[PDB]
Amino acid sequence: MVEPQHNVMQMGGDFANNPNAQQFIDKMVNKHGFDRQQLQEILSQAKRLDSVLRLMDNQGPNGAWLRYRKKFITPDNVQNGVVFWNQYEDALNRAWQVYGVPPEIIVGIIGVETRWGRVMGKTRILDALATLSFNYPRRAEYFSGELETFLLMARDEQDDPLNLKGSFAGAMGYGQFMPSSYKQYAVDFSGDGHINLWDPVDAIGSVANYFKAHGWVKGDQVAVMANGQAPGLPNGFKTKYSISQLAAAGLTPQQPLGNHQQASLLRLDVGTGYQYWYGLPNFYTITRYNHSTHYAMAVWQLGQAVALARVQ
Numbered sequence: 392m393v394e395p396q397h398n399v400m401q402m403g404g405d406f407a408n409n410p411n412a413q414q415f416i417d418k419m420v421n422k423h424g425f426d427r428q429q430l431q432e433i434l435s436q437a438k439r440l441d442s443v444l445r446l447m448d449n450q451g452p453n454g455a456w457l458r459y460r461k462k463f464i465t466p467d468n469v470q471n472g473v474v475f476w477n478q479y480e481d482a483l484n485r486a487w488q489v490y491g492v493p494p495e496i497i498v499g500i501i502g503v504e505t506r507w508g509r510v511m512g513k514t515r516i517l518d519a520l521a522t523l524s525f526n527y528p529r530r531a532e533y534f535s536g537e538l539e540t541f542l543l544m545a546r547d548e549q550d551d552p553l554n555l556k557g558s559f560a561g562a563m564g565y566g567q568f569m570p571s572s573y574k575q576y577a578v579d580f581s582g583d584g585h586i587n588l589w590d591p592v593d594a595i596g597s598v599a600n601y602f603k604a605h606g607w608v609k610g611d612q613v614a615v616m617a618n619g620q621a622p623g624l625p626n627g628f629k630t631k632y633s634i635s636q637l638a639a640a641g642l643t644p645q646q647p648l649g650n651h652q653q654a655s656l657l658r659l660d661v662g663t664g665y666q667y668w669y670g671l672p673n674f675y676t677i678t679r680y681n682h683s684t685h686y687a688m689a690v691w692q693l694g695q696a697v698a699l700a701r702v703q
């Protein structure tokens with residue numbers, strides 16, 4: 392009947408003689424009441440995926456922006472985005488009212504992330520997270536905390552840690568939430584009492600809550616294209632310049648910037664030259680989801696492209 396197996400102190404699998412795995416097991420038992428033998432049986436089935444390690448290590452004008460953009464903004468994609476928007480219009484409108492994050496932004500996020508649920512990932516979250524926690528020193532602490540949180544999520548939401556699949560970094564569902572993002576920002580938007588990242592309605596409200604929690608200002612502008620070139624200045628979402636500095640560099644806003652006294656300098660490689668943008672606070676917020684200028688511009692433009700296609 393009851394099999395404590397106090398003596399089975401040694402697990403097999405790819406993490407058997409791994410000190411990190413043992414320390415992690417100790418932590419989970421001590422800190423959360425996890426049973427060592429149960430956890431060992433789980434981690435013994437965990438796999439050390441070398442590809443997850445090679446991929447994390449791997450992370451002019453030649454048209455760079457255009458190549459990234461065509462991966463997400465195509466007729467097929469925009470069309471699929473319209474379908475997703477109409478199918479979940481109530482959930483999107485309700486997220487707009489509760490969090491102040493517009494439907495196009497959520498449609499854009501979920502679009503760039505999983506093509507509205509068509510590409511959720513094929514890697515078991517446990518394998519990816521265990522690999523990065525135990526065989527990847529550089530970000531071993533971050534990922535260990537992700538693994539720690541994933542295992543508590545499996546317990547709380549009554550999931551099997553081995554059945555859940557996602558990205559090579561362990562991101563999950565429609566919005567590709569990392570375990571800690573789930574813990575801090577996910578919400579039961581569907582109202583069934585359970586926070587499921589694979590439920591389109593939950594992902595929608597969770598993406599909006601994540602945005603609001605990261606500073607999204609309702610009604611404010613994301614980015615404003617500029618007339619002109621400013622080759623002297625450095626660029627990226629991390630940069631910061633006053634409007635006065637940008638004007639003196641040869642730029643003018645195609646749209647009124649209002650009370651915005653500062654902006655970042657975004658530069659997109661459009662093949663024939665460079666396209667300059669005034670990055671406003673809301674664009675910085677989009678990058679809090681995924682630290683990339685290209686990622687955020689794709690999310691924004693796809694959302695806008697889908698928004699237009701609905702009107703037509």
Ligand SMILES: CC(=O)N[C@H]1[C@H](O[C@H]2C[C@@H](C(=O)NCCS(=O)(=O)O)[NH2+][C@@H]2CO)O[C@H](CO)[C@@H](OS(=O)(=O)O)[C@@H]1O
Nearest residue numbers: 558559560561562566567568569572601679680681682
């Ligand atoms: C919504 C969400 O959970 N965003 C998190 C993001 O996930 C990214 C990770 C990425 C991912 O899974 N990348 C793997 C690469 S591949 O596509 O499988 O090849 N997708 C997710 C959503 O955009 O990773 C960064 C950095 O870890 C996190 O920032 S941090 O807290 O400061 O660390 C951020 O919170």
Ligand SMILES: CC(=O)N[C@@H]1[C@@H](O)[C@H](O[C@@H]2O[C@H](CO)[C@@H](O)[C@H](O)[C@H]2NC(C)=O)[C@@H](CO)O[C@@H]1O
Nearest residue numbers: 462502503504505506510511512558562567681
């Ligand atoms: C080569 C290519 O075009 N790949 C696409 C992937 O980039 C997409 O994967 C998703 O990309 C975002 C942005 O980096 C990640 O944050 C997210 O985790 C990732 N999703 C998954 C499940 O791994 C994919 C979905 O749009 O579509 C292409 O395969």
Ligand SMILES: [Ca+2]
Nearest residue numbers: 579581585593
């Ligand atoms: Ca739910």
